[PDB]
Symmetry: C8
C-alpha cells in the first residue's frame, strides 16, 4: 500500500529543466514511464501507462456522436504525452502542458488514488479557496 | 466479530504528542498501519489500508467528468495520510487533519463497522443535537 | 424451525441487573453472543453477530455521500454493542440502550424472523395503538 | 399435486377447544406443524413452516428503513405462532388470532396454492360481496 | 403437435351428469387429471396440473401487499378444483363452476395453447360480438 | 436458405376445393403439415407447426390479466387449425378462415421469413395502397 | 479485410439484361448468392444470405402487434428475392426492385459494412444534396 | 504502449502527391494498411483495419430504422477507403477526402487513442478557438 496508493499532498518545485521529482515513495507505484496529459481545472494528470489505458475505456463509453464527447477526447488525448521517469525519479513535463497548467516554480502534487495531479501551488490554493464544502459537493453525487 | 466489527462509542483524549489510543479491542481489527483522511461533518475517518482501498473503488464509480466528483476526490484523497499504529496501539494524527477536525483535548471514537470516525467531543455532541430523528432520516433512504 | 425462526410475542421483565431472559426456545437461534444496537421507534434490535454483519451490507448499498445515510449509520452503529448471552440465556442490556428504549420493568419481545425487537410493554402497546391497518400499510409497499 | 396444491373452498367449524380440522386431503401437504400468523382482511394464514420461511424472504426485499415496512413486519410476525397439527389432523388456533379473525363457529378455508386462509364464514361472504369483478381487479395488475 | 397444442374451436354439449367430452385429439395433451378453476369473462379454464402449477408462478410475481392481487388469487384459486378425466375422456365440471360460467347445454371449447377455455355457446358468441377488432386490441399491447 | 427463408410475392389462385398450391420452392420449408390461423388486416398466416409453437411463446410474455391480451389470444388461437399439406403441396383452407380473409379467387402469398401470409389479391392491393411510406413507418419503430 | 468490409462508392452501370457487376474485390465477400430486397430512400439493399438472416432477427425484436411493424415487414420481405451471382460476378436485379429503385442506366454502389446499397446515380446525388450535416445527424443519435 | 496508444499532436505537411508521412513512432501501431474515412468537423479519421471493424459494430447498435442512422452510415462508410501505407510510412489520401477535410499544405495529426485524426492546420486551430472549456464540455457527459 505504502506505494501503490496515490494519496496525500506534496510540495515540490519545478526544476530549471522543467522536470519534476516524484516523492520517492511514489516512484514505486510507477515503472519508468507515465502518461501526463492535461487535467481539469488546469492541473495536468499523471498515470501509469496501463492505468491511462483503462481511463480511456471510460470514454468509449461516452457517445461519440455527441459533439461534446469529441471535444473532450480531443482536448485531452491530443495533449497526452508519454514521458520516461529518469534515474532520479524525475519527470520532464512538456512545454504545452507546462503552459496549460501555468506551472512556474513551486508545484503541488496530490494523490487521487488512480492518478496524480500536478498543480501550480497558487492555482491550487485558489481552487481550494472557492469550492463549496465537502458536505455540499457530496450531497449532489 | 469482537474485533472485526467497528462498533460503539469510546471517550478517549488527544495526547500531548497528538496521538490517539485505540480502544485495545479495536487494535485487533487493524494491523500496524491505517489511513486517516478527512471525514464528513469535520470528523476524520480511520480504515485498515485494504478497506480504504475498497472505499476508493466506490468513487471511480462516480463520473469524473463531473466537477463535483473531482472536488470530492481532491478534498478527501489529498488529505489521506497513512499512519503507523505504534506499539501501545496509538496513532499520531496529522496537524492538518487535527485542525480540520477541530481536535483539541477529549476525543470521541465511534464504530461505523467498515471504518472508525474520530470526533471532537463537543462537535460530536452538537452534531447529535441537530440531526432529525433516526426514523425521519431513515424514511428518506 | 422451532428455534431458527424468530416469531411471536413474549412478555418478560427487566431484571434488577438490567438483564433480559431470552424465551428458551430462542436461545437456540443464538450462540452465546449477539449485537444489540438501537432500533426504530425506540425498540432496540437483537441479531446473531453474523446476521448483523449482513444487515450492515444493506447500508453500504445506500449512498454515503448523502448526509442522511451518514446520520443513520452513526445513530445505529455508534450504538451497537456486542453482548454475551450468559449461562441462563440472559442478556445484559447496556444503559444507553436501556434509556434509549425507555426500558423500565416489563419488556415485550417480538420476533421479526431475522432479528428480535425489545419493547417497553407500554411504548409497544401505544405503537400498536396508532399505526394504520395492516391492509393500509401494505397497500403502500 | 392432489396434496401439493392448496385449492378450493372448505366449510368446516371451530371446535369447542378452538381447533380446526384440516380437510384430510390437505393434511398430506403439511407435516405435523404449521405457522398460522394473521392474514389480510382478517383471515389468518396457514403455511408449512418451510414455506413461511420463504414468504419472509419476500419481505427482506422490502426496504426496512420505511416506517411502513416495519409496521407490516411487526403486525404479522409478532403474531405468527407455530402450531402442531394433532393426530386427527386438527390445529389449535391461538386466542389472539381467533379474536383477530373474528372466528366464532363455522369456518371457511380456501386454498391459495402456497398457503391456506381461514375465514369466518360471514366475514368471508361479505368480503366476496364487495370486491369488484375478477376482470376489474385483474386489469390493474 | 397434433395433440400438444391446444388450438381451435369445438362445439360440444354439457351431459346430463354435468360432464364434458374432450375432443379426443385433446385427450392426448392431458393425463387423467386436470385443474378447472374459473376464467375471465365467465369462461372456466382447463390446464394439465403441471401447467396450472406454472400459471400460479406468474402470480407470486404480482405484489401480494396489493389488495387487488389478493382479490385475484382468492377469486381464482379458491375456485380451482382438480378433476379426473374419466375413461371416455370426459370431465365432470363442478356445480359452482357450472353456475359461474352459466353452463347450460351446448358448450364451446377453444384452445389457448397453454390452456383450454370452456364457454357457454351463447355467452361466447356475445363476447365475440363486442370486442374490438383484432388490430385494435393488438395495437395496445 | 432458398427454402428456409420465406420471401417474395406469389400470385396463385384458390382452387374449386378451397385449396392453395404452395409455390413448390416453399414446399421445402414445410413438412406435410402447417398451422393456418387468422392474421392481421384479414390475411391468414401460415407457419410450420414448430414455428407456430414459438410464435405462441411471445404471447405468454404479454400479461394475461389484461383484457386485451385475452381478446388477442382468443381471436387468434380459437381460429388456428392445423392442416396437412397434400401430395401436390396444396393446402385446404378452412371455411371460416376463407370467409375471414375474404378469399375468393386469386390469392397473393408473401413471405415474412418466419411465416407466410395469404391475401386476397384485391384486399392486398388496397392495403398496399394506403400504408404510409416505408421510411415513415420505420421512423416510428 | 480488403474484401470482407463493404466500404466505398462505386460507379457502375445497369446492363441491357438488368444485371449489375459487383466491383470484383467485393465478389469475395459474397458467395454465389445474395438477397436483394428494397432499401430505404429507394435504394435496394444487398446482403450475403446469412447476413440477411441476422438482419431479420432485429425485427422479431420489434413488437408485431404494432401495425407499423407489420407494414415494415411486409414492405421489405415481400420484396426480398434471393439472386445468384453469375460467373462474371454479376447480379440480375428483379424488375419490381428495378422500378422501385428507379434504376435506369448508371448505378452507384456504396458499402455499408454489413450490406451494400444500390443507387440510381441521380437519386443518390440528390439524397446527398439534402440531408443535414454529418455533425447534425450525429448529434441526434 | 509507446506505439499502441495514439496520442499527441504532430505538425506535418501534405506532399505533392497528396501523401502524408506518419510520425514514425506511429508507423508501429499500424500494419501496412489503414482505413481513412471522413471524420467529424471536417477531419478525416485513420484506423487500423481491425479497429475500423470494431468502430462499425458501435453502429449496428444504432437503430437502422432511424433516418438519421442511415444518413450517418452513408456519409461515413461510402467515404471510407482502405489505403496501403507505403515503405516510407506514407499514406496517399484520396481526393474526395482531401477536399472534404480542406487539406491544403500543412497538416495536424492528433492521437485519439483508438484512431488518428488528420486536420488542416488552420481548420484545427479554429476548431480549438471555439469549443467551450474542457470543464464545460465534460460537465455535460
Amino acid at each position: 500500500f505504502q506505494g501503490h496508493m496515490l494519496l496525500g499532498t506534496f510540495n515540490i518545485t519545478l526544476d530549471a529543466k522543467n522536470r519534476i521529482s516524484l516523492p520517492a515513495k511514489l516512484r514505486a507505484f510507477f515503472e519508468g514511464s507515465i502518461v501526463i496529459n492535461r487535467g481539469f481545472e488546469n492541473c495536468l494528470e499523471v498515470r501509469k501507462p496501463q492505468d491511462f489505458q483503462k481511463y480511456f475505456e471510460q470514454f468509449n463509453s461516452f457517445p461519440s456522436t455527441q459533439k461534446d464527447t469529441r471535444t473532450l477526447k480531443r482536448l485531452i488525448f491530443a495533449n497526452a504525452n508519454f514521458v520516461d521517469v529518469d534515474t532520479a525519479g524525475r519527470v520532464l513535463i512538456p512545454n504545452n502542458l507546462i503552459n496549460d497548467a501555468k506551472l512556474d516554480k513551486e508545484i503541488v502534487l496530490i494523490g487521487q488514488f488512480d492518478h496524480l495531479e500536478i498543480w501550480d501551488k497558487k492555482l491550487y490554493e485558489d481552487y481550494l479557496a472557492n469550492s463549496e464544502s465537502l458536505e455540499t459537493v457530496a450531497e449532489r453525487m
